[PDB]
Design a protein around this nucleic acid. Structure first.
Ligand code: CL
Ligand code: CL
Ligand code: CL
Ligand code: CL
Ligand code: CL
Ligand code: CL
Length: 276
DNA sequence: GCTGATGCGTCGACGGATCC
DNA sequence: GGATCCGTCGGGCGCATCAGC
């Protein structure tokens, strides 16, 4: 039940070469991840745009190593005001975005540090660290309300420029998206409510799941494994990290990768190749 | 300033019952 | 009586705060 991500496809269905490489990585403690050489892997991957989630780091505490990325020199960071040490997201880009914003409507009052929006010439990029439903589903109702607020927010944005949404969306959409579907239907990340919310997200905005679009029947493809019980060595995992795309961008889609071998978090990186 | 405790956030292994 | 279903329970990791020094 191990998994080998197939080779990188770097040309679109119409034969156009990839021009844009976006990497998304839920790093689960940015400072720890850097100590575990996460930036060395990033340099090898050489993305045009790097989106990070669960940084657990306010901007004043960013390691200096992050100042020595000449190919990712435009950097935007967010962290929650009243929950330091949790959430936190970042977006780093080769080229300067046209516009950058934070949160999903009222960040200035509910500084949550979970979402960054960056508008580029031909698309809008959103990265998100979606709220976990919590152990015992204690925060599932909050998650459901957040899912609705986020859908409404994104519908707004995609009504003008094509959208790319990436990050830790904290749900395995369908049974194929985790190793143990039967045992986890009452656990955060695989409740009927969260799965429904993801389906409504695809239909309402609308968006497509880039990986599943390309690999509709491929099992055992995950992006998260608990640190407990050696799960990663057994590939007992969940696909929690996505690139979701406006349908108008599917002709630009070259590939959507899962970088299973890259260590330094309990999530692995995912990478998108677009021909723009 | 430093270490290590505690707090907080964040499911697969296992044993036993049930299915035919 | 092997496969499957089901409920219980021990438990890695990062970071903030705190105690001790
Ligand atoms: Cl967190
Ligand atoms: Cl938010
Ligand atoms: Cl999907
Ligand atoms: Cl363990
Ligand atoms: Cl994915
Ligand atoms: Cl792939």
């Amino acid at each position: 039940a191990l998994y080998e991500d197939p080779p990188d496809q770097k040309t679109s269905p119409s034969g156009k070469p990839a021009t844009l490489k976006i990497c998304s990585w839920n790093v689960d403690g940015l400072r720890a991840w850097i100590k575990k050489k996460g930036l060395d892997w990033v340099k090898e991957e050489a993305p045009d745009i790097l989106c990070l989630q669960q940084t657990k780091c306010s901007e004043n505490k960013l390691p200096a190593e992050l100042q020595e990325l000449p190919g990712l020199s435009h950097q935007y960071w967010s962290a929650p005001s009243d929950k330091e040490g949790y959430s936190g997201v970042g977006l780093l880009s080769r080229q300067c975005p046209l516009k950058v914003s934070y949160g999903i409507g009222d960040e200035e009052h509910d500084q949550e540090g979970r979402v960054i929006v960056a508008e580029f010439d031909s698309f809008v990029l959103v990265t998100a660290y979606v709220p976990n439903a919590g152990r015992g589903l204690v925060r599932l109702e909050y998650r459901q309300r957040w899912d609705e607020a986020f859908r409404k927010f994104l519908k707004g944005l995609a009504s003008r420029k094509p959208l790319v949404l990436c990050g830790n969306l904290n749900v395995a959409h369908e049974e194929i998206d985790l190793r143990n579907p039967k045992g986890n239907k009452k656990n955060a990340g695989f409740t009927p409510q969260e799965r429904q919310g993801f389906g409504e997200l695809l239909q309402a905005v609308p968006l497509a799941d880039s990986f599943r679009h390309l690999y509709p029947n491929t099992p055992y493809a995950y992006t998260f494994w608990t640190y407990m019980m050696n799960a990663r060595s057994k590939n007992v995992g969940w696909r929690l990290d996505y690139f979701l795309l406006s349908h108008s961008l599917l002709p630009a889609l070259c590939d959507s990768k899962i970088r299973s071998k890259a260590l330094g978090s309990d999530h692995c990186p995912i990478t998108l190749y677009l021909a723009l």
